[PDB]
Each structure stands twice: as structure tokens, then as C-alpha cells.
Amino acid sequence: GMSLANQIDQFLGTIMQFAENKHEILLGKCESDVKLTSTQAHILMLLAEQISTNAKIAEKLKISPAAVTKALKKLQEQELIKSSRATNDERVVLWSLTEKAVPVAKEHATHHEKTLSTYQELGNKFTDEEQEVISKFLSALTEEFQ
């Protein structure tokens, strides 16, 4: 029965507790021990879908080619991805998952879907009017953190 301010405080405290040293909030049992940044895991997820290039990656992930390079290089060092050259265009460097990465990508993607479906399920317990309230609260609150 605390104030909303206190409940918001506890909620955000619970998020930071839950995040521990991670920078991404993800639900779902987590088996992998492969320490990845979020940008790195998202490259993995992308490549689980389709062998891709740094251009297509930067575009898809809406980050800079430079940041894609940094992540690829780290992923590659960890032998989670491997570069190849496109058979039809020698200028084209492709990136794809190594077999070691496939479960890592598929796991992170499963987290994403588990998390999002949990939020959607929650969302669905509220009526439109309630969802607008929650959406307006979230927007206001998000603004305080940007």
C-alpha cells in the first residue's frame, strides 16, 4: 500500500536487481554462458536468420557500420561468427553463425520472444483505456530517463 512514487521506485529497483550486470532486460530461463553485449547478441540473431553483411546489419539494427564492425570483430574473436566472401562478388564480405553460435542466437531470440510475449500478455489484461493510461505513464516516465 505504498505511494505510487515508492512503488515506481521499488519497481525500478527490482529491474536493476534483476538486470544485475546485464544491460538488457530479458525474461526466460537462460542456459548459455556466452557473455555477449546486446548488440552482439542481436547480430547473432540476425545471422541466425540470414547470412548477412555489415551494411545489411547496421541497417537492420539501426546502428552505425562502425559499431557493427566492433561487434563482429568481438563475435569473430569468440568464433561465434565467421566471415566469408560472396561467391558472386569478391568485394562482399558475408557473416554467418558458426555452429557454436546457433544455439546462442536461438536462445537469445527465444528470450526476446518470451519477454515480449509476457509483456503482451500483461498488456492484454488491461482495457484500451487502461492501456492508454499505462502508455501515457510509461511515456512520461521514459522521458525522465532519456
Name the site residues for a copy of itself (rule: CB under 8 A).
Answer: 3-19, 22-25, 27, 115-120, 122-123, 125-126, 130-131, 133-135, 137-142, 144-146
What residues numbered 22-41 form the site for Zn ion, per CB under 5 A?
A: 24, 30, 32, 38, 41
Torsion angle of alpha carbons 122, 124, 127, 130, nearest 10°?
30
What residues numbered 64-123 form the site for Zn ion, per CB under 5 A?
A: 107
115 binds, among Zn ion, a copy of itself, none (CB under 5 to 8 A by kind): a copy of itself
> Which residue has its beta carbon closest to Zn ion?
30
69 binds, among a copy of itself, Zn ion, none (CB under 5 to 8 A by kind): none
133 binds, among Zn ion, a copy of itself, none (CB under 5 to 8 A by kind): a copy of itself
State the minimum distance, in angstroms, from the CB of residue 30 to Zn ion. Answer: 3
| Nearest alpha carbon to residue 118 among 29, 28, 38 | 28
- 28 vs 103, beta carbon nearer a copy of itself: 28
- 82 vs 114, beta carbon nearer a copy of itself: 114
